[PDB]
Each structure stands twice: as structure tokens, then as C-alpha cells.
Amino acid sequence: GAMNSSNYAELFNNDIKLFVDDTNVYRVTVHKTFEGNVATKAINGCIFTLNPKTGHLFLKIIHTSVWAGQKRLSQLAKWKTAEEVSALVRSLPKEEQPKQIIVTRKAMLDPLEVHMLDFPNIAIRPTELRLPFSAAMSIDKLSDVVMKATEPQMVLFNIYDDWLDRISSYTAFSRLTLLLRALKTNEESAKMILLSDPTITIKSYHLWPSFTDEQWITIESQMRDLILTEYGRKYNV
Amino acid sequence: MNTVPFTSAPIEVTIGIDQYSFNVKENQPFHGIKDIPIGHVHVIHFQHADNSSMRYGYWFDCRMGNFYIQYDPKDGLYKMMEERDGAKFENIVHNFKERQMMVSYPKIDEDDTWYNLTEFVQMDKIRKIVRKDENQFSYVDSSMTTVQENELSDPAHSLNYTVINFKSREAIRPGHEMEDFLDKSYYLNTVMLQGIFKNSSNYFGELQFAFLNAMFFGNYGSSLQWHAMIELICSSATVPKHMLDKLDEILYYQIKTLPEQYSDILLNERVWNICLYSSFQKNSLHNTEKIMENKYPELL
């Protein structure tokens, strides 16, 4: 069943698995109409599909055109997400297909299960973890490709850059979740921490700056401090 | 008016005939049930005074043969049997009636309850759900499992209800995943009604038989079948108007008949709340919604 603190190491074993996050699929700005009513305008979204072992990110861009003339968009977004994940699994060679898909929100279970009936051997699982994947649109290069898209498009990234050359998946995923947790709690602060020293740049083929092992430790400490401060503020403790 | 004689009653037992029931004492001179209405299926059912586990019984139609009950001291149950000798049977029944050793099927003339619970139930359909082709009558008990329950183990002693599964390739057309899952009209009308049942009468007959097995034997798999068949109709946006009107009547008599004390194990909170308050048909079951709201407002 559900993925939790107890079965955490399973993410880094040799069974292919993908996380699916649908939180940035259907995005709107709410505005006033001339008559003073409220309306939404959809903006481009994305499905965040991640192999936590390899760092391979299957970023499916959701162009606003998919919502044209559709009703109940927040319900349709779960089904569109399941349709796109299913199409991705079918496009992969058999030996690359996942054995499990873990959805970050329980509302994705039935839509994915129904789309994947052809794949009875692929287990669809929820999680107890409160993963910060919603903050993926706070990564500048991912935000840039989503907002510039003029049509449906799939873009492949490695969300760990070259870290697996130096650290284990376990350590790479903990670093990723700490960066995204910080970006989600205080985006401006998190982004200042990452880019303040202009001598450390982001390679053209990377998402994150080229920190040495020592600089990652300092960065990781600043992100921890950011998170706990905001927690004392949120909760006056 | 037809008769099911009993050879004897050697063990103390509560005997059910349709919705009626009688206590018989160990070695009481009880020789059976007379004045059984012709034209309907019937169920004769048993609960031993010494083992209130294993309710068991026999679905039969008196037009299909002469049936009697005889206790088997080896297998330890009241068994239905057919008497092929018509003259031996008439002669046995006439004696027991003369000696008034038979209870009378106690039907009130105003009372259409049994007709209303068995309107679409046919003995030929019961015999396809309960397979024992050498007998004209069908044995059911508390513990028998359904074909669907066995997939998720003895096939000889199983209830072969039609398998309904909302998350199955049968239920969901490729490329209509969201549409077929949120509106089950395709699954109800093409797969189930046109494809498997052929007409709404056979569909209602299985639904009614599943309810009665759930109520009379506390058969859990029958209860699951009855709820699934209700939910498939309530979760369809497109249902023939006559089917909706008839479903309302069927469910009304089922809820009216259910023992008040069993509503907590025989009624699935989620299905009834969904069917009466959320589903496409939420406004189509007026009689059923009124009896449920007045008799079981806790469940809702």
C-alpha cells in the first residue's frame, strides 16, 4: 500500500519506479471582470514525473489549449494527468517501464488505475510523505520552458544534475526535497541563498549551481535554518 | 395451493418459509407446510437451535415437482428431496393434512410483499447462479462464496452472480476512461443489459435474488452483489425511465422488509449515501429515499 517514513529506502532499490505530481497541471490567475465578477485565466502547466533513483524527470507541458471548452477542469486535470502518464509508460521499452507509480495526491489513484488497466503488473500507490514537488515551478529553467510552450510538449531533465557522480540516490533525493521544501516555504529567501555568490554559476545543461561538496554543506545548512525560522513564524513558537 | 411435507423434525430448529418463520421443538410432530401460493419462487430455510451459525435453505417452485424435507442424521441437516411417485406423494400429503400436522403458509390477502420481493426472480435463473443440475431446487447457506469473491475456493458450492467491477476492461472503453468511469451508462446498457442479461427483467431478477440471499442467510457476497447492481444503475446518467420507476419499487419493498436490527450489517453506508444524494439518479428514487430517511436516518 502507501509509501511512508518506514519504507523510504525502497525508493533507491533497483525496481524502476516513478513519482507523479499533478499539482502544477491546472494553473489559473483569478481576476475581476469589467462587470466586477470573478473569472479565471488558465496558464501553462506541467506533470512532474520523476524517477527518484536516476533523477530522470519526464516534464509533460500542459498547454492552456487542452482546457478550451472543457467543464470541471480540476477533475479533468487528474484524468489528463493519468492519460499522459499512461501514454509515457506505453512509449517506454518494456525493460524501462516502471514496476510502481507513486502519486503524491490520493485523488490521482482512481484516474491512474483506470488508465493503466492494460498494465495489471504496475502497482499504483499513494504516499504518507508530504513531498514538496509543487515547488518545481520555482526552478527557473523548468518555469521558463513551461511558460514559453506554444503547444503540448514533453521535455526530459535530470533534476539531480551530475550529483550521482559524487553521492548516492538517497543523498541526492534528500538534497532535492530540502531545496524544494525551502523554495516552497520562502521562495525569495531560498533563491537568494542559491544565487548570492555570483562566482558559482549554473551550467547550461544543469538546473542548480555547480557547488563543491563543501559549498553544498553550507547551502544545505542555510536551507535548514530558512525552513525552521519560517516554522517558528508560521506557528509563533 | 401446494405442500412441502416433512418426514419428521428430529432436531430443534427455526424454520423459515419466505418472510415467515416458526420454532419447531426436538421430535415435535411437525409434518410440513401447506397452502404455499403457486406462481412464485419460494425459499424454505433453517437455523438449528443448537448452532445459530449456518443459516441454510432451498429455493424451489412447486410447479417443477413434488418436494419434501427429511433430516439426514449423517450430514446433520434438513435436506430437500424430490418424490417422483405422484400417488405416494398425494397419499403422504393427504394423511398429514387429515391429521393437521402441517402449518399453513400464513399469507394475508391484502399483502403483496412476497410478489414485490420476487417479481423478476425465475427458478431457471436461480439454477444458473447455483449449479447442481441433478436437482430442480437450489441450496444456499451463510458461508457460500461468489465467483468474484473466489478471484480475490470450491467452484461446485459457489454463487455464480454476474461479475461487476467498475475498474475492469469490461467496464471501461479504451479512450473513454474518464467518461465510462464517471458515467457507467455504457457498462449498464451495452455490456450488461444488451450483452449479458439481455433485458432489465433478468437484471432485476438477479438483484432481487442477491438481496434475499443477503437477508435470509446473511450471505456477505450476495450483499456485495445487491449493492453493486444498485450502484451500476445509480451511477449511469442514461437509464430507461421504466427501469428507474421499477428500481424505486424494488428497493422500497427490500428496505421495507429488512429487519430493523440488521440495517447496520446489510446496508452499505457509502453506496446508499452516493445513490440517494450524489449519483445521477439522486432525484429518481422518491419511494426508496422516503422509506430510507424515515426508517434508517442514522445510516444517512
Q: Residue A147 maps to which CATH number?
A: 3.30.420.230
| Experimental resolution (Å) | 1.7
Chain B contact present for A110, CB below 8 A: yes
Inside any domain, residue A100: yes
Strands A17-21 and A100-103, by their bridges, are parallel
Inside any domain, residue A98: yes
Which of helix, strand or coil describes residue A125? Answer: strand
Q: Which of A75, A78, A81, A114 to probe the B interface (max B CBs under 10 A)?
A: A114
In sequence order, the 6+-apart residues with CB closer than 8 A to the CB of A229 are none
In sequence order, the 6+-apart residues with CB closer than 8 A to the CB of B216 are B16, B43, B45, B55, B57
DSSP label at A65? G
**Is residue A184 exposed (0-12), middle (13-18) or buried (19+ Cβ within 10 Å)?**
middle
DSSP label at B191? I
Inside any domain, residue A79: yes
Q: How far apart are CA B174 and CA A114, in angstroms?
A: 10
Assess whether A130 and A184 both reside in one domain. no
Assess whether A21 and A76 both reside in one domain. yes
Cβ–Cβ < 8 Å for B256, B227: no
- A198: containing domain: 164-237
Which of helix, strand or coil describes residue A29? Answer: strand
Assess whether A100 and A136 both reside in one domain. yes
Q: How far apart are CA B224 and CA B149, in angstroms?
A: 10
Q: How far apart are CA B181 and CA A1, in angstroms?
A: 23
Domain end: A133, A163, A193, which one? A163
For chain B, the residues whose C-beta falls within 8 A of a C-beta of chain A are: 167-169, 172, 177-178, 181
DSSP label at B276? I
Radius of gyration of chain B from its Cα atoms, rounded to whole angstroms: 21
Count Cα neighbours of A231 within 13 Å in the Cβ-side half-sphere.
Answer: 8
With contacts defined as CB-CB under 8 Å, which chain B residues touch A108? none
Domain boundaries, given as residue ranges, for chain B: 1-143, 144-300
Assess whether A45 and A122 both reside in one domain. yes
Assess whether A63 and A24 both reside in one domain. yes
In sequence order, the 6+-apart residues with CB closer than 8 A to the CB of B33 are B3, B4, B15, B17, B44, B102, B103, B104, B105
With contacts defined as CB-CB under 8 Å, which chain B residues touch A114? 167, 172, 177-178, 181
Assess whether A211 and A189 both reside in one domain. yes
Inside any domain, residue A89: yes
Domain end: A137, A163, A189, which one? A163
Cβ–Cβ < 8 Å for A129, A4: yes
With contacts defined as CB-CB under 8 Å, which chain A residues touch B178? 76, 79, 111, 114
Technique used by the depositors: X-ray
Using the beta-carbon criterion (under 8 Å), do A110 and B167 form an inter-chain contact?
yes
Assess whether A179 and A133 both reside in one domain. no
**Alpha helix segments (H runs only) across chain B:** 86-98, 113-118, 123-129, 147-151, 177-182, 185-186, 200-217, 220-234, 241-257, 263-266, 269-273, 286-295
Assess whether A159 and A178 both reside in one domain. no
- Residue B27 CB coordination number (10 Å): 11
Which H or E run includes A101? strand A100-103
Q: How far apart are CA A164 and CA A170, in angstroms?
A: 10
With contacts defined as CB-CB under 8 Å, which chain A residues touch B172? 114, 117
Assess whether A141 and A173 both reside in one domain. no
What's the grid cell of residue B25? 421443538
Domain end: A163, A190, A220, which one? A163
Cβ–Cβ < 8 Å for A5, A45: no
CATH of domain B144-300: 1.25.40.550
Total H helices, total E strands in chain A = 6, 8
Nearest CA in chain A to B174: A115
**Is residue A28 exposed (0-12), middle (13-18) or buried (19+ Cβ within 10 Å)?**
middle
Among B117, B43, B26, CA closest to B80: B43
Assess whether A153 and A195 both reside in one domain. no
> Residue B57: what are its φ and ψ, rounded to 5°?
180, 180
Q: Which residue has the cell 458450492?
A: B157
Cβ–Cβ < 8 Å for A136, A21: yes
**What class does CATH assign to B1-143?**
mainly beta
Using the beta-carbon criterion (under 8 Å), do A113 and B167 form an inter-chain contact?
yes
Assess whether A32 and A144 both reside in one domain. yes
Nearest CA in chain B to A75: B178
Cβ–Cβ < 8 Å for A201, A209: yes
Bridge partner list, A43: A27
Amino acid in the structure at residue B182: L
**Chain discontinuities in chain A, listed by preceding residue (C to N exceeding 2.5 Å):** none
Using the beta-carbon criterion (under 8 Å), do A117 and B172 form an inter-chain contact?
yes
Domain count along chain A? 2
Assess whether A121 and A172 both reside in one domain. no
Amino acid in the structure at residue A48: F
Q: How far apart are CA B207 and CA B225, in angstroms?
A: 7
